[PDB]
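Box 3.1 — From sequence to structure: Fn3-like protein
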Amino acid sequence: SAPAFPTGLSAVLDSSGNTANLTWNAAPGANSYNVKRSTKSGGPYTTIATNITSTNYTDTGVATGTKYYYVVSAVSNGVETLNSAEAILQYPKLEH
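Predicted structure (token representation):
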């Protein structure tokens, strides 16, 4: 009876630590998404973007060097869903 909600959220820095690049799995039923952020694990979260219609978002507002935590929700025929499971901001994996 709950509408479906975003899952699989990943929040990855670019290699300069300047931006946070989010990606998540689409929520069946969604028209758009809300991106939310906290400086501490578990929130409360602060909304940073609304009316996002793709399954990705770049958060350019992070302080370089600071840990952040994110969740994303969907808005589905005007009804906001649960927030996703939390993603911990991380640098990308170094390859090879």
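Summary of the box: Residues 17 and 65 are 7 Å apart (CA to CA).
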